Symmetry: C3
């Protein structure tokens, strides 16, 4: 009678226990203590309650769902996915997650400690899927929330290596949904062809979601894959920290991005990226503004390490029929980034910052301002023509660069015959150091190629740190680019032998509120008079010059040209030199031309 | 006979077990394995040992204390506070923690894994409390240490929403006490009116205490609350990382600070703050110097994200009758901070850095030096008159600003008719970018308003990046401010139309060791002579000028004024221009005035 | 019959259990649930299976190894080392780890949760040891890999305080070996005399190894100890974050370094160091290039806090007979570092950055370039003569400094009569702030002491922020140092009273592509003529000057010297001043001398 009870499933509920024989402790039963924890083993059984061994011919989905459902009913807990086993998933889930191609439905307060491996079975080959889904409805707008759900451990989610079946399909690892206080920590996501590994939030709904100390390895493998971003952050007060991202496929170099930050108060820090096209999108989509407003602000990309083939940070905002998105108050700092070894033009255009047009290619919808890019290093190998500190391809309302080291082909670039951005408040401080890797590679090119509709309230302080006499100019403005209320300077160091330093093809440097200085070579002739004697430029293209001074030595004993010059109404420079002996003098001098500076 | 044993509390101690049937493993009893873990359930029982269910009518305090006391007696371990339950605390603790209004006493090597919720019962309404206390004596000076105590998990400490009863009361979540190697990780502290959530150390006693990945939500709710700082770090080699802080109450905007760093080798990094008055105090109180000395050095505030209503970082030090506090070797970097939407003067004065007078208002006790503020961004909306990069309100022995982006009303500010700080070694590098949000808002205001007793060994390199013709001046020194051994420059860009650029109301720019340059408009007249001809200023206020040069074009054909000028004993400027044709000339020219630069 | 089964080691395998009486759960036995976890207690038994209590007279090694071996055989898991006990190790391991003086052999997928203490017994006194070893062969080249091995918890590894027996011995805590996805988290390593606490990887073999939230306390204690580096990172995609390092021994101040980064894509962040000689080596040893190539790139040292006695970051690379090592793409940012209180020359030369010769002292093997040092603060007390922002002691192919605050004796230093580095692409931006702690201490010293074979493509923009008239010069080039294609400037602020500002002992400033400016005092005499009149320098050492301008006021009424000057063939300066009344004039003027700038 007793023996029957003990051998039955209620047996442990009849064996008494008291902690460490402490007479002050609770008099419990063994089952009570065992009930303090829970694992997949407690649900991975047949209809008679006999345990089933996991394996490639067993679909563990229903058992894991039963475990989640049950623990949810008790107000939460943590379910262990045991180490030393691979648990295969081989069918779709049902109900609310079916509209998301869901496999498992996550529930509030139910954490998963993944110590073993979770693997997708070949049922999923060529099919869409989202492995873990926190939505509870096929329509995310009708979904309830997921709260207090954490996935962590030393285990692995393996996507089975299966290619996408069609470019239009979506695949995801964890979609937390309308997610509040959810996180993934320590998990390795590997061996797939997916759209995302993890998505946080839904159109601004959610908060306090984080991805920390995760690894993402080889998650693009085919030409069918339309696009890949490993973590898409779509709720505020959320971010990615201390993660590792690696791709090996050729396709990843063209399509894969590590992180996207799509809502305010989000961050991407302390991570390492290899083999990707792009580092991070930092954007406000008007279409995603429902949950947290139409502004992406307090956006932080800091202290990351990356080898990429396209652009590191892409900035943007856009509009819908009724909502306008805005991006402001962004900081990009402490990152060390290189374009990996590749042929020129063999991947999307290399850039540290890209100001990206919208998804339809429009460059006149953006509202991007108050961005600080500081204390970063960027490098691109000498052969990579398509590399720039900033590719400025859409309207920009402000971006500030201070104290970076940029070693690539271009500093500021946009292509002519493409977009014509309207640029305001572009600040390039003199503390940005321009590297020399691309010296001698710049035939026919302008280091700062200002291919814009207009530039206002901008500062470009060019400072070279080595010679590059191959370049056509340091900075060039086409006649089509209006320039006003701006400061453009070219420091003289390493420029003595340059034919062109700053070029203004529409003579824009003459503007009332343009403040400019740059070196030029000027031919002068003096009057004959002995003593104090004027020297005048032969050319008459200096009506805009407020002062100029000598950057040349005087090889003569019998006279000296002026140290400094002003101009005249007819566009000549004029200054007072000294003829020890009389005579008409003719000299060619290197001058720093200055306007209002 | 056997049946009786099995059903008794020693039953599990009679059921044999060997790990995975391994014949090489220990032959144990089931109780031995169960004894490897411990939970509140093992102590949450009545005097007959029957388990008690937690709930709002059950006071769990004595049971949790019994658990802590017992595990301590075995040299430590980790007690789980089970998920799926709310455990209410409804009485004060006894003994050493009673002097601290303590609820639970923490003990060395006894960790708490909080997975469920800990809630305060209405017994605590209008009363003081400190929930977890690591002191073992009512007098902290007589207390032993708390060592190796970690509180972690996915659970929650909820303060029940109760208001303070009186402003003089104190409330805290965790007071680790004289704490060595203690930490809180992952916990959410919420729904209260408290002084602090967590305090680390006691007057410099302690080491290696940390708060990581915690959330602090809505911890001020009344006008009775005197003051709130969420984490107060009062031992060295300690800090706060990757935390989230949010307040929603109006009162929090006026009284709440996220962190205070009060001892050397402390840090605050990677955190996000919303709804607070202040970011962090970084201070050395002489009254707190007992355990780790009278110097706060190696203080780090980095890579945080904040929306606040008052000051981001407040620096200070002070004295007692017998001890002098010193603050030095501080770094504030990578932070992105905004003043939230508010009316001018509706919260404490907005600032990125504040040099704060002591608790009695004294501005002549401080010893603050070797501070680096670099690579931060600050923004305040255009209407917020009371916003400054630095409010410099007490004596300052040094602070260095490099490569920040400050977009607010003032750069350097102090109020006239208040304190008169003595300032040394204030360095504002030219790489600080001054934003344009407050353009046109500055009528009657000085961008750098130097309301100090004196300034020495300081550098202010003003560089505008857009026009603001509303401001009275870029930088102004009242006659009461001595200025010596300093460099003050105003770059000409965007200044052509400014009536005043740099203003020295006591003519302080004439000092022997003052190095200055700024733009001015000067009226000149020449002699009649044809050829090389002198031009002289009409005014005689330039006896201090070492050189000047033209920032204006010359619209004339028949003559040119000098490109460059020196001065004369009588205070006139003089230079040599050129009269192609003779005649007295009279011109008004924009000049860069230079002294010793 | 039943009673016998129940009391036997298979007893728990006969007591039934079903989770929380859920009829949908697996019908299990108690043993199945207990088998979900494992501890040292399951293996710490005698040959009859009776548990053995740990203690100082019990060697726990064989039992822990048995536990690891068994769990490995089941595909992994986590073994707990129980809290409340000290587990002593008192013998060497056997097999593959014997060649490494190994104690315990780690195995793939077998994690250790150390909650208690692991202590070395006096068997190890005066002997070599490596406590945990992941190699499986005495020859690391013949070793298999260690994968997915994590050591974590609140516990402690204590090295027993034993001194090294001989300098040639090696001691280590954790050698992960050829290690992929291995980590140590939360552990305190203390009380020893060891070579390393943790090593990651082997000669570039390994990946994704990390040390996080560990403490390292008092790990050098004798003069026998040859060298100590607490963590040596010898695989890529690996790093150290949020750790604490402290030493108290005098010997540690001379020999101990906190971290070494020896492979690409490695990092050291967010850590605090006290009592060490050095912060981090960042190097590529040719001898270590087998697993990951001959380039150390993407090296990050960020946001650390340190008090050290020697050098913070040491850069280097070297060669073997057949392999050349290269170091490039490095970032050092956000660190706050001081040289601790010590006598001048009482520890290795104080430096923020050191360019270190190879292990044989060779300075002509290095290939170091594309290094960015930005946003750091460094301080050394006034008495410490041997303190420098950079000690540049070996060939350097590039290093860029932007926006740092350096407060120490020297900015750039190398000793004369030692190495003669060949320097390229050294960039010192004007945004580096030079502190004043060492003002008045610099008799006979050059702030930038350019003791090199040659300097090319370099920039030194000196900006003082206070006076130091004690120094011999701001920057000095000996005649032995070639200088070409470089920019050297000394801002005039705080220099008026300096006898020497920039010194070129070989007249190197005359080079065709040298761009220089600095202040000097010049004696001039004029001709007698009334009106516009030339002034000429008495000395003829200005043939290299392209322009000069006045930094002095003119105390005269009757004349003015020129505001600006050029030169003549004979090396005189010449400019045009103005004699209101005639007469030969003689003046001594402070000028800014400019060449090509
Ligand atoms: C892969 C990726 O992240 N690409 C981004 C791109 O994102 C957009 O394209 C995606 C393509 O996969 C997504 O669109 C697909 O998915 C949508 C969402 O799926 C439905 O809803 C979810 C919740 C549900 O589980 C599913 O079952 C579906 O029912 C589909 O509606 C759409 O048809 C698909 O093509 C992505 O959608 C977002 O996905 C996230 C994460 O899952 C969700 O949280 C959002 O709700 C959802 N958003 C919307 C509006 O539906 C698309 O947003 C980015 O747009 C670009 C950004 O870069 C570009 O724009 C900026 C700003 O103007 C410019 O600066 C750049 O220059 C320009 O290139 O980047 C890609 O990398
Ligand atoms: C809320 C807060 O942190 N405010 C700080 C302010 O701190 C001071 O005021 C506090 C008000 O709550 C504290 O004072 C109260 O508490 C003291 C401590 O309580 C006793 O001791 C503890 C251990 C015990 O558990 C309790 O039961 C009590 O017996 C009381 O003695 C005092 O009477 C109360 O008003 C705070 O005290 C410190 O608290 C910490 C954390 O608990 C303890 O570790 C310290 O031991 C204790 N220190 C002392 C000396 O007792 C007070 O320090 C700060 O002073 C200011 C700093 O800013 C100001 O000064 C700087 C530097 O000069 C300037 O730059 C600024 O401009 C100026 O404003 O900031 C507030 O935010
Ligand atoms: C203590 C320390 O880290 N010092 C470094 C120094 O490192 C070199 O010296 C070490 C002295 O302890 C090591 O050498 C010893 O150990 C070697 C390895 O041991 C064997 O192999 C291991 C795997 C096995 O378990 C053991 O049982 C042994 O069989 C011995 O071969 C050698 O004889 C010992 O002296 C260190 O070796 C490396 O150790 C790591 C970690 O264990 C291993 O992963 C590597 O395989 C091993 N490397 C090699 C090549 O064997 C030595 O590398 C550094 O060299 C210097 C760097 O600074 C100097 O050089 C740079 C670059 O040129 C310059 O810029 C500097 O100016 C110059 O000073 O720093 C010391 O702090
Ligand atoms: Na869908
Ligand atoms: Na245009
Ligand atoms: Na008290
Ligand atoms: Na005064
Ligand atoms: Na060996
Ligand atoms: Na030489």
């Amino acid at each position: 009678q007793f023996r029957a009870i003990i051998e039955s499933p209620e047996g442990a509920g009849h064996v008494g226990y008291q902690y460490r024989r402490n007479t002050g402790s609770t008099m419990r039963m063994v089952s009570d203590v065992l009930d303090e924890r829970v694992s997949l083993w407690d649900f991975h059984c047949d209809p008679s309650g006999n345990v089933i061994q996991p394996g490639p011919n067993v679909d563990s989905r229903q058992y894991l769902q039963a475990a989640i459902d049950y623990v949810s009913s008790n107000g939460g807990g943590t379910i262990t996915i045991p180490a030393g086993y691979t648990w295969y998933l081989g069918s779709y889930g049902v109900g609310g997650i079916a509209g998301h191609s869901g496999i498992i439905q996550l529930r509030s307060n139910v954490n998963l400690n993944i110590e073993g491996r979770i693997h997708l079975s070949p049922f999923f080959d060529l099919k869409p899927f989202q492995v873990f889904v926190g939505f509870d409805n096929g329509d995310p707008a009708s979904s309830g929330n997921l709260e207090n759900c954490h996935i962590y451990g030393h285990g692995v989610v393996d996507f089975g290596g299966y290619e996408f079946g069609a470019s239009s399909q979506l695949r995801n690892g964890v979609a937390f949904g309308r997610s509040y206080n959810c996180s993934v920590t320590g998990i390795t996501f590997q061996n797939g062809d997916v759209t995302w590994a993890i998505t946080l939030g839904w159109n601004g709904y959610g908060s306090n979601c984080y991805v920390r100390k995760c690894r993402f390895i080889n998650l693009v493998n085919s030409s069918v894959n339309a696009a890949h971003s490993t973590v898409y952050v779509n709720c505020p007060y959320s971010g990615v920290e201390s993660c590792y991202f690696s791709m090996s496929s050729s396709f990843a170099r063209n399509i894969a991005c590590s992180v996207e930050l799509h809502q305010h108060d989000t961050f991407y820090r302390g991570s390492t990226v290899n083999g990707y096209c792009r580092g991070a999108y930092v954007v406000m989509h008007a279409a995603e503004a429902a949950g947290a407003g139409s502004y992406a602000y307090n956006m932080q990309v800091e202290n990351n390490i990356a080898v990429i083939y396209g652009q590191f940070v892409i900035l943007g905002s856009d509009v819908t029929a009724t909502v306008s998105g805005h991006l402001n108050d962004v900081i990009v700092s402490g990152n060390i980034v290189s374009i990996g070894e590749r042929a020129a033009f063999s991947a999307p255009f290399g850039a540290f910052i890209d100001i990206g047009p919208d998804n339809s290619g429009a460059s006149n919808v953006q509202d991007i301002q108050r961005v600080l890019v500081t204390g970063n290093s960027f490098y691109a190998p000498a052969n990579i023509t398509d590399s720039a500190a900033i590719t400025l391809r859409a309207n920009l309302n402000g971006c500030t660069f201070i104290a970076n080291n940029f070693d690539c082909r271009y500093m500021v670039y946009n292509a002519p015959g493409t977009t014509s951005p309207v640029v305001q408040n572009l600040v390039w401080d003199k503390s940005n150091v321009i590297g020399g890797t691309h010296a001698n590679q710049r035939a026919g090119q302008n280091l700062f190629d200002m291919q814009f509709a207009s530039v206002v309230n901008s500062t470009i302080e060019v400072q070279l740190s080595c010679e590059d006499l191959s370049m056509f100019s340091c900075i060039l403005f086409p006649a089509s680019c209006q320039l006003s209320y701006s400061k453009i300077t070219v420091d003289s160091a390493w420029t003595k032998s340059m034919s062109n330093t700053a070029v203004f093809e529409g003579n824009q440097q003459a503007g009332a509120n343009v403040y400019v200085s740059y070196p030029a070579t000027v031919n002068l002739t003096s009057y004959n008079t002995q003593g104090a004697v004027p020297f005048f430029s032969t050319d008459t293209n200096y009506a805009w010059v407020t002062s100029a001074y000598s950057l040349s030595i005087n090889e003569n004993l019998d006279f000296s040209p002026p140290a400094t010059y002003t101009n005249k109404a007819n566009g000549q420079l004029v200054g007072v030199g000294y003829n020890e002996i009389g005579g008409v003098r003719s000299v060619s001098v290197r001058l720093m031309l200055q306007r209002q500076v």
